[PDB]
């Protein structure tokens, strides 16, 4: 029951890898302590392998099965449709990994005959063959972090032709089933403000609120063949075309359950018997499996009035405190139950009685004040990683622009507004690229977004309050200030000055550019403006922006 097996061949890169933070003429204006930023490479792949390789044990009891039966009952009310080849193709990221069969993402998106014919042939093979394991590629991810160094994460994905077939058979499923099965507990259905709203309204729902987060040690490796088959049983509960049932069955047996691992050089690196992190069902499956195990675990632990919030492998639980002593005991029972379900904790879960002290999805609730001085809750997080990546993206263009995604997701925060917005808008203006669409990711899906639309986008996801928040909490203030000292980032005084400069230059531009200056940097001037709803803000089609998670799902969308 080992998560993985290895032949000994090394996980190889498909291009030159940089470890040290690239430096340019802009670097210092943001960060001085360059040696604290690094990017993980294949060189550490070996360390990760040893961490994610272990034997799994599972003891499923009646609570587990009772929760599963309930989940299947909700799942049966779901009706999913097969996606056409064209539809699935249009969902393919312009820069997705090219197929090993003579065509790439560009060919897929343009519906080239070669790409369509191969896709159709792969689809046919899935319907006729439900046994032969599908090949996958294992790569060491290149991610940027701040020191104090972690080994590179691994990514396992099948060929482009297969990814397109996954979409056809399961896109509609993984996009709609989770919300029906888990209801208000499915986190990807909420925007940042909606997630904060759900957490506060839930916290208040309890007379004696108590909450905690649960971090499973390498969740993907804890997923057993049973878990993957259980997820399939849930999918099959949906009303599906017979052709889709066969495709989902086949993908489960040949890909999801496990298969061979091939490095970028074509050598067999080993075999996988756990969750593949680079497939379409990675997010939905982890969310379903985490919710199933945690729900059953809550019962075993006898937690009162439990309200859960699940996002992939990230879990949040808010319930009725039965006392400080009893809570601690319950939590331990919960952990023991989770462990029996093959989901041991990486870090011991601790009970919190202060919402702001609960961190889930690397984030936490905090409070500030809007123009009217009213108390307003918002989602924030430790700026360290976001700032380390912003430095890298300062001297190196990357496939994913983390700074953009961070600005969109945490626009109300002190650090995103003061630093991220000021810094990158200054750069955009200098290169006159304000209107250039850039790629960023929201909940694992890729989106092409033009900086000039940030104002309208932020107003839609956070409301005008994001443009005028102030008097942040002492806790948040200290955490940001510490980060800035650690990384060597200029003080507010400096950023405010740079913001006025950027703001003035934007206003001169006019059009949307001026809108960016007026709204994004109204906090910089001494005499703030009124700031009213943006007209074109209703034209934006953010329908599929916050519906589900697609981490590793190879999903694309054009705004
Ligand atoms: C990171 C270290 C730090 C210094 C001061 C604070 C706390 C601040 S600044 C602020 N408001 C200003 C602001 C500065 C930068 C921003 F990005 C937003 C708001 C502001 N001026 N005019 N309107 N609002 N409110 C607080 O509690 O944190």
From Swiss-Prot:
- Give the Phosphoserine positions (modified residues): 29, 42
Binding positions (Mg(2+) 2): 215, 313-314
Consult the record and explain the modifications the protein receives after translation: The N-terminus is phosphorylated by host PRK2/PKN2.
Query: What binding details are noted for the cofactor?
Result: Binds 2 magnesium ion that constitute a dinuclear catalytic metal center.
Q: How does it sit in the membrane?
A: Single-pass type IV membrane protein
Q: Which parts of the sequence belong to the RdRp catalytic domain?
A: 209-327
Where does the protein end up?
A: Host cytoplasm; Host endoplasmic reticulum membrane
Q: How is its activity regulated?
A: Activity is up-regulated by PRK2/PKN2-mediated phosphorylation.
Look up the record and name the cofactor or cofactors this protein needs. Mg(2+)
Quickly give the catalysed reaction. RNA(n) + a ribonucleoside 5'-triphosphate = RNA(n+1) + diphosphate
Tell me where on the tree of life, at the top rank, the source sits: Viruses
Q: What does this protein do?
A: RNA-dependent RNA polymerase that performs primer-template recognition and RNA synthesis during viral replication. Initiates RNA transcription/replication at a flavin adenine dinucleotide (FAD), resulting in a 5'- FAD cap on viral RNAs. In this way, recognition of viral 5' RNA by host pattern recognition receptors can be bypassed, thereby evading activation of antiviral pathways.
How does this protein assemble? Answer: Homooligomer. Interacts with non-structural protein 5A. Interacts with host VAPB. Interacts with host PRK2/PKN2. Interacts with host HNRNPA1 and SEPT6; these interactions facilitate the viral replication. Part of the replication complex composed of NS2, NS3, NS4A, NS4B, NS5A and the RNA-directed RNA polymerase embedded in an ER-derived membranous web.
Question: Any idea what this protein is called?
Answer: RNA-directed RNA polymerase
Lineage of the native species? Viruses, Riboviria, Orthornavirae, Kitrinoviricota, Flasuviricetes
């Amino acid at each position: 029951h080992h998560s993985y097996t290895w032949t000994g061949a090394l996980i190889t890169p498909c291009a030159a890898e940089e470890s040290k933070l690239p430096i340019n003429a802009l670097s210092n204006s943001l960060l001085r302590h360059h040696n604290m930023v690094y990017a993980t490479t294949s060189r550490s792949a070996g360390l990760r392998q040893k961490k994610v390789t272990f034997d799994r044990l599972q003891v499923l009891d009646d609570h587990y099965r009772d929760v599963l039966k309930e989940m299947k009952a909700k799942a049966s009310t779901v009706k999913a449709k097969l996606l056409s080849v064209e539809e699935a193709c249009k969902l393919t990221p312009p820069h997705s990994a090219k197929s090993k069969f003579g065509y790439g993402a560009k060919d897929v998106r343009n519906l080239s005959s070669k790409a369509v014919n191969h896709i159709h042939s792969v689809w046919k093979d899935l319907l006729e063959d439900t046994v032969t394991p599908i090949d996958t590629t294992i790569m060491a991810k290149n991610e940027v972090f701040c020191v104090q160094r972690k080994p590179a994460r691994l990514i396992v994905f099948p060929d482009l032709g297969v990814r397109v077939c996954e979409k056809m058979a399961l896109y509609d499923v993984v996009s709609t089933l989770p919300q029906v099965v888990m209801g208000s507990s499915y986190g990807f259905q909420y925007s940042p403000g909606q997630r904060v709203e759900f957490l506060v309204n839930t916290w208040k729902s309890k007379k004696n609120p108590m909450g905690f987060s649960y971090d499973t040690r390498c969740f993907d490796s804890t997923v057993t063949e049973n878990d993957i088959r259980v997820e399939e049983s849930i999918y099959q509960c949906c009303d599906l075309a017979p052709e889709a049932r066969q495709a989902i069955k086949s993908l489960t047996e040949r890909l999801y359950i496990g298969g061979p691992l091939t490095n970028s050089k074509g050598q067999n690196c080993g075999y996988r018997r756990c969750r593949a992190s680079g497939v379409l069902t990675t997010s939905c499956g982890n969310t379903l499996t985490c919710y199933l195990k945690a729900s059953a675990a809550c019962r075993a632990a006898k937690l009162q009035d439990c309200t859960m919030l699940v996002n992939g492998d990230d879990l949040v639980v808010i319930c009725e405190s039965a006392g400080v002593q009893e809570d601690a005991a319950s939590l331990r029972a919960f952990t023991e139950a989770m462990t029996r379900y093959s989901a041991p904790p990486g870090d011991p879960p601790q009970p919190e009685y202060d919402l702001e002290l609960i961190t889930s999805c690397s984030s936490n609730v905090s409070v500030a004040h809007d123009a009217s001085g009213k108390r307003v809750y918002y989602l924030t997080r430790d700026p360290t990683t976001p700032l380390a990546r912003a430095a890298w993206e300062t001297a190196r263009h990357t496939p994913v622009n983390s700074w953009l995604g961070n600005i969109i997701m945490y626009a109300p925060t002190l650090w995103a507004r003061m630093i991220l917005m000021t810094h990158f808008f200054s750069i955009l203006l200098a290169q006159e690229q304000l209107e250039k669409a850039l790629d960023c990711q929201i909940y694992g899906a890729c989106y092409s977004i033009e900086p000039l639309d940030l104002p309208q986008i932020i107003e839609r996801l956070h409301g005008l309050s994001a443009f005028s928040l102030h008097s942040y909490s002492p806790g948040e203030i200290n955490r940001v200030a510490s980060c800035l000292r650690k990384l060597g980032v200029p003080p507010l005084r400096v950023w405010r000055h740079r913001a006025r400069s950027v703001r003035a230059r934007l206003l001169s531009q006019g059009g949307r550019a001026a809108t960016c200056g007026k709204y994004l940097f109204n906090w910089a001037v001494k005499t703030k403006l009124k700031l009213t709803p943006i007209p074109a803000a209703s034209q934006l089609d953010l329908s599929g922006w916050f519906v589900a998670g697609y981490s590793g799902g190879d999903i694309y969308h054009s705004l």
